[PDB]
Design an enzyme around this catalytic site. Structure first.
Site, mmCIF file in Angstrom:
data_model
loop_
_atom_site.group_PDB
_atom_site.id
_atom_site.type_symbol
_atom_site.label_atom_id
_atom_site.label_comp_id
_atom_site.label_asym_id
_atom_site.label_seq_id
_atom_site.Cartn_x
_atom_site.Cartn_y
_atom_site.Cartn_z
ATOM 1 C CG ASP A 173 0.361 -4.183 6.348
ATOM 2 O OD1 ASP A 173 1.217 -4.616 5.482
ATOM 3 O OD2 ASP A 173 -0.438 -3.252 6.117
ATOM 4 C CD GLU A 229 4.978 3.344 2.649
ATOM 5 O OE1 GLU A 229 4.525 3.558 1.501
ATOM 6 O OE2 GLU A 229 4.958 2.210 3.222
ATOM 7 C CE1 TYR A 256 3.999 -0.415 -0.380
ATOM 8 C CE2 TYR A 256 5.639 -0.465 1.314
ATOM 9 C CZ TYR A 256 4.376 -0.110 0.875
ATOM 10 O OH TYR A 256 3.498 0.582 1.709
HETATM 11 C C1 LIG Z 1 3.995 -0.508 9.489
HETATM 12 C C2 LIG Z 1 3.081 -0.933 8.392
HETATM 13 O O1 LIG Z 1 2.029 -1.484 8.595
HETATM 14 N N1 LIG Z 1 3.487 -0.642 7.174
HETATM 15 C C3 LIG Z 1 2.730 -0.947 5.969
HETATM 16 C C4 LIG Z 1 1.997 0.311 5.466
HETATM 17 C C5 LIG Z 1 0.844 0.640 6.452
HETATM 18 O O2 LIG Z 1 0.035 -0.532 6.472
HETATM 19 C C6 LIG Z 1 -0.281 1.607 6.197
HETATM 20 O O3 LIG Z 1 -0.509 1.671 4.757
HETATM 21 C C7 LIG Z 1 -0.131 2.957 6.934
HETATM 22 O O4 LIG Z 1 -0.395 2.982 8.378
HETATM 23 O O5 LIG Z 1 1.386 0.004 4.233
HETATM 24 C C8 LIG Z 1 1.921 -0.941 3.304
HETATM 25 C C9 LIG Z 1 1.178 -1.057 2.044
HETATM 26 O O6 LIG Z 1 1.322 -2.107 1.299
HETATM 27 O O7 LIG Z 1 0.444 -0.054 1.786
HETATM 28 C C10 LIG Z 1 2.973 -1.699 3.610
HETATM 29 C C11 LIG Z 1 3.659 -1.541 4.924
HETATM 30 O O8 LIG Z 1 4.176 -2.800 5.359
#
Ligand SMILES: CC(=O)N[C@H]1[C@H]([C@H](O)[C@H](O)CO)OC(C(=O)O)=C[C@@H]1O
Length: 489
Positions: free
Chosen positions: A48, A325, A443
């Site tokens: 991320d 989400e 996802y």
């Molecule tokens: C903007 C961002 O980072 N989104 C990520 C989100 C986040 O990391 C965290 O879980 C909450 O702040 O989590 C995940 C994950 O695979 O869980 C994927 C996303 O890409």
């Protein structure tokens, strides 16, 4: 791969994006019947942000059978886009790019009434991710009007004495006067009409040391870069571009998060797709799910004017910033059901009956196991009755330990004969297994394809696990007819 797996990669290591890794699928059948997709092009392994990530995009003319070359509609050039194999060792696997800007977590949406397609992604300034964003909106008000704020290099830290105003004209807000600097439509910087530049970074490993070093390649100085003379406030932004020509060309970059609450740390997209309301009072309303570390956790942004203006709404008052989400379906009247991830060990449901302006209390969804940290899900409407009822589909992993055992479920909608948010009941009658219970599944994004087949782009590994980081070719595309899916285990 089997015969059945031929054509099951849209984005892959070695394609045009120049990324070795991809995550965060977005898949959407357009009204015309063209099909589009998007994902993170994660260059620096599957981390991320903070990292180097651009948003990838591809499409299918043949009803989603086959995919064209990928494009990069949202991209930064402060660090180069290249294919690098990220280390997977106990130490190195954790190393990420410290200094690049990123676009991350896409949402695709179509306005069917105008045939406009919007692409949204979180927009991260240099070295920022949700986890290390600052608290603030990133904008200032000057005589009542919001302008993106800027830090001049030679000013005191945390001092934002400048703003991007009309024409991209950079103003000094202390004296309220235009400077010789401006930004163009890409938010690249100019001094007295002349493009400012800076040196692109490369990244290479030497052992488990990541070496982020300037090259001799000039790129446009951008206000989102680490090495810009003027810099945005280091929080999370929302970016959007639209295309009227099914992703052939894109509009100019829009930083749409002018409504970011001053009290919020991050406000980001619930990845997948957005929704246009088809039925009822608010039919034609465009809505996109969001979540935040703010006053609220779950939120939405909506447009009642085909994308030109966006209104932010809070769906709760949780301040703990759990990863809510969400994806949204429509009931046949036109009320909204939203299904969301939580950090409370279950998937949750919420209803709105006023087109997404207010929402009911979260209701756990018993029928699906998940982990404490949760995973993103995909939910959609199916256009056809199913056992003579209106139906939705949900895709999500189905395990309490890890991201695995992905299922596609069919829910059947009934009127309960009660009233309001309780008008309707969803019967989760069918449960299709995508692979086996031990196979990784993270996802995902469903779409109904033109022929009435169901399309699925998903992460076929566990993207949370610290032991499955930095895998290639884990982003898989499969198609199903509706009878395959009608399984009762
Ligand atoms: C903007 C961002 O980072 N989104 C990520 C989100 C986040 O990391 C965290 O879980 C909450 O702040 O989590 C995940 C994950 O695979 O869980 C994927 C996303 O890409």
């Amino acid at each position: 791969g089997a015969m059945a797996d031929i054509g099951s990669n849209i984005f892959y290591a070695g394609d045009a994006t120049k990324s070795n890794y991809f995550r965060i699928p977005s898949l959407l059948a357009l009204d015309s019947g063209t099909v589009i997709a998007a994902a993170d092009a994660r260059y620096g392994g599957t981390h991320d942000a903070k990292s180097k990530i651009n948003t990838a995009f591809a499409k299918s003319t043949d009803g989603g059978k086959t995919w064209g070359q990928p494009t990069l509609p949202l991209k930064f050039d402060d660090y180069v886009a290249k294919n690098i194999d990220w280390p997977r060792d106990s130490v190195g696997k954790n190393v990420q790019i410290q200094g690049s800007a990123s676009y991350i977590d896409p949402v695709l949406l179509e306005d069917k009434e105008t045939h406009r397609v919007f692409l949204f992604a979180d927009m991260m300034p240099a070295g920022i991710g949700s986890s290390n964003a600052s608290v603030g909106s990133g904008f200032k008000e000057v005589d009542g009007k919001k302008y993106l704020k800027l830090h001049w290099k030679d000013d005191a830290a945390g001092t934002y004495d400048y703003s991007v105003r009309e024409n991209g004209t950079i103003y000094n807000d202390t004296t309220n006067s235009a400077t010789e600097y401006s930004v163009d439509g890409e938010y690249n910087l100019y001094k007295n009409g002349n493009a400012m530049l800076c040196k692109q970074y490369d990244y290479n490993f030497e052992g488990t040391k990541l070496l982020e070093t300037q090259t001799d390649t000039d790129v446009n100085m951008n206000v989102f870069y680490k090495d810009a003379d003027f810099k945005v406030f280091p929080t999370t932004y929302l970016a959007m571009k639209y295309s009227d020509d099914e992703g052939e060309t894109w509009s100019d970059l829009q930083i749409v998060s002018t409504f970011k609450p001053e009290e919020s740390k991050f406000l980001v997209l619930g990845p997948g797709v957005g929704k246009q309301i088809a039925n009822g009072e608010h039919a034609g309303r465009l809505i996109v799910p969001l979540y935040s570390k703010s006053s609220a956790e779950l939120g939405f942004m909506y447009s009642d004017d085909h994308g030109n203006n966006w209104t932010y709404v809070e769906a709760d008052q949780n301040t703990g910033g759990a990863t809510a989400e969400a994806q949204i379906v429509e009931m046949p009247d036109g009320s909204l059901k939203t299904y969301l991830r939580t950090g409370s060990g279950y998937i949750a449901q919420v209803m709105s009956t006023d087109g997404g302006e207010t929402w009911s209390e979260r209701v756990p969804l018993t029928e699906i196991a998940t982990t404490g940290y949760g995973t993103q899900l995909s939910v959609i409407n199916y256009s056809q009755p199913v056992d003579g009822k209106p139906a939705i589909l949900l895709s999500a992993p189905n395990a309490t330990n890890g991201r695995k055992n992905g299922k596609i479920w069919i829910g059947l909608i009934s009127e309960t004969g009660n009233s309001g948010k309780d008008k309707y009941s969803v019967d989760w009658k069918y449960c299709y297994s995508v692979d086996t219970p031990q196979m990784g599944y993270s996802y995902s994004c469903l779409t109904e394809l033109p022929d009435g087949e169901i399309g699925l782009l998903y992460e076929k590994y566990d993207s949370w696990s610290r032991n499955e980081l930095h895998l290639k070719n884990i982003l898989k595309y499969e198609r199903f007819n509706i009878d395959e899916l009608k399984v009762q285990p």
